[model samples]
Target: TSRGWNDYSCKPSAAHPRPVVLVHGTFGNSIDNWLVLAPYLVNRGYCVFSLDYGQLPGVPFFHGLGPIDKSAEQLDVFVDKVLDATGAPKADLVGHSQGGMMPNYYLKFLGGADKVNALVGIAPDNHGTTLLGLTKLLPFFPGVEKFISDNTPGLADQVAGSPFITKLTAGGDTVPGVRYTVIATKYDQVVTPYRTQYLDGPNVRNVLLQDLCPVDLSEHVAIGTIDRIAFHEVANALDPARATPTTCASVI
Candidate 1:
């Protein structure tokens, strides 16, 4: 449950062949965010692995609280370890919240595309939202911006229109040779103007949970925590060949 790895190894089956690495979000450790999805993927015949990243020394229970760029360095190391352990040339990445955006930092700056087959984000702040639209008011708060930048640089960096987000997507988002999928919900209360979660590119597949199942009102926490309908879409994102048309009635 703390910051570490959970090894659920399954041999490659005919249906699903690659291993999957589940990345947790800000304030979430490995097991907490992935309790449902990791086992689900394992049962579906995947070598499921998850890791805890971005923990400051002596921090307990909570993880992913470190500066995101530094956490991304940890991810680069963890991805190499996963490939080494699973013996898979590439692994698919499934991330929730900050987990989703962090891997893109890895893919863009850390040569992750070569090691990752696909990247799937659940309720990710891809373009960096305004934190439920409060960040637009930060400029009026004077020293509040400096305090946030000093204490939690990762969070300050993730705010909408921050230099970090600008630099992240400055050139383009999709790197060639990797498939990208982003699943978001209109009801997400964390990432304001949820449309920011979608990426614009040739190889990117952008999805709205409501579009797939209109009645499915899973928001930021529910989307990542325990949403089976969202999980179905996640499976589809992982292996598009086996994708079945999801409908509104798929909600439970």
Candidate 2:
């Protein structure tokens, strides 16, 4: 089985009543991004689902390359499908990078908060990022910036201070009723000034991977993919009611 296309017959357990929908980031597809996390969630007895969204024409394999709002629309449809198939009232979301932040659009503007129980982001770019100053070079490149904005709007949206990000963070970092958990790594190079990944709200929990494991040096991708330490934290974030300490020793 692809694991991405698991048995729709799978249902949520009483211990884990909500199905989990894993969202991938820019340049990420459904299966390749969640290879580690998906099975990890399933092994723990949760019904997990993943989808391929935001595919630009001619772009093979990798996805999440479209406008963020359009991508969130895709997420809306996928989440509804998951809910219909599992017969669950709501679903939990686990997103990586842009995957982590895009859902906020759905929650705030697309009626997702009512249907989502929790959102667990692995190195999400909630407040946008400076890309370690690489984005600063856009002005020097002249039309190059427009080219990127025209071609891959998602990339432009991730740049700190972009109009999309400014609007996304306009009122606040979160909405009401849904639980938010952000798992960030100090060593993340992509979402620089990683502290920006943290959100401020009543039901929010922000965690730094290095604080839990002093030597765990997973960057942007590893934290979302194969880092067991981060995965342990993700598990806890998904089920905060029964969350255990996520230590380096808690590696699965």
Candidate 3:
């Protein structure tokens, strides 16, 4: 409904058969997160859809604050809805932050791999994040850990080495028959050591945005929002067979 997305009537063409499902990060919603990316994909002749998940009760605008596994369940259902609406056999997933990493739960445990064709994560916390080491302070601050765990279970789940993240990455970072692409920015302040965002798997392709655009300074949010260069890489990852080389000049 927002940004002209979630149009169930939209149908896929031969060139873009799979509908693109946009998953937002923690504290992000269906509309606000994809304000730029949704239109970008739609203009490129692709059907796009986005959903608001992991919402904590009593929380208003911001979402993606609940438990990670439950969020994956929401995603599993949403993807099915998209496929049913578009009459397509499979759909592609594009997520930012937790949105990027959460889908792996669906792919690995929720029977999502068979339904998804590809997954493109922008600044995803695939191996979990340290929050730039802020989480380390949780131990020093009494009840802070329990406070976060009691309130935003999703945030706690994202902390590196948390139980949820541990299980998600246990048998490896990916499953079979799914193409994976991760786009990271060196300036990312969210997923520290940004390389941790990369998935280790057969079909995984990890990319560094700065390598493509030397002067590009987009961080976690910008990469998923308004960074045209990163968007270009997403376009390539979505359709690798006919991908044009992505460079700083590709932003144009």
Candidate 4:
């Protein structure tokens, strides 16, 4: 459960026929990661919820650090619970960075497309970042990359060319019956060459925060965590039938 959204369920009305689930990024837990966005959705009459995924044994307050494969399994159960609680035929997913990427695994292999309507990713790294060419430099570091993989499996998985990313991206970037929106910031540092975040699939809309708001300058986590500009885009993603235009005056 999160600060004020989780454990509470509001029935899906005609305007909002599905609940929305928020997934956090690497080293991000359920509640802290969504402090801003959960309330954003809740305020709009959406039945919003969030869950903690990819937790390690002793790590507290920090999650999404385990093997992402296992993390998706946790997501599987959480979405099921959300649907059960609300009786919504489907739910929309909103994720930040690693949180944004995990849904692809669930949709492709874990059977999420049937239960999800849209996936709105805020600075999500759908494709690995090359760790900003850090992967290229790993050979010089010798065992450092291995050490990161040994400890925080999720970190290595997010690096470009990791087996986790390879498989998730190899066959396809999306499944049928689901809409995808990837919101990325050009000034991103965590996921470098930020364009890599774009998905090469149908029903996908890739956006650069700067494109929407030229003066906007959102670095990696900032876009998802605190940028109401990105939040406005997310609101549009969840409900396109009544979507408003995004601008510098995006939202509060």
Instruction: Assess each prediction's global lDDT (C-alpha) against the native.
Output: 0.77, 0.83, 0.85, 0.83
Tens-digit per-residue lDDT, 51-157, candidate 1: 89877556554566677888889989988987786666888899998889889989999998899989999988888866544344344334444334334666666
Model 2 per-residue lDDT at 117: 87
Query: How well is each residue in 1-252 modelled by candidate 4, as lDDT tens digits?
Result: 222377554686688888899999876778878888889888887888899987777667667778899999999999999899888789899999898999999999999989998999998888877555434434433444433443468777887788999999999788989999999988887787888888878799998899899999878767888899999999999989999989998756
RMSD of candidates 1 onward, in order: 5.2, 4.4, 4.4, 4.5
Most accurate candidate by lDDT = 3
Candidate 3 lDDT, 60-128, residue by residue in tens: 556777889999999999999999889999999999988999999999999998999999999999988
Higher lDDT: candidate 2 or 3?
A: 3
Q: Which is superior by lDDT, 1 or 4?
A: 4
Residues 1-252 of candidate 2: C-alpha lDDT, one tens digit per residue? 212235677778788888889998877788889888888888788888898888877766667668899999999999998888888999999999899999999999999998998999999999887654434434423444433443377777777788889889899888898999999999877787889989999999999898899989988878998998888888887787888887889766
In every candidate, how many clashes are there? 0, 0, 0, 0
TM-score order, best first, reads 3, 4, 2, 1
| Structural similarity to truth (TM-score) of each candidate | 0.87, 0.90, 0.91, 0.90
| Cα error of candidate 3 at position 168, Å | 0.4
Worst 10 residues of 2 by lDDT: 137-146
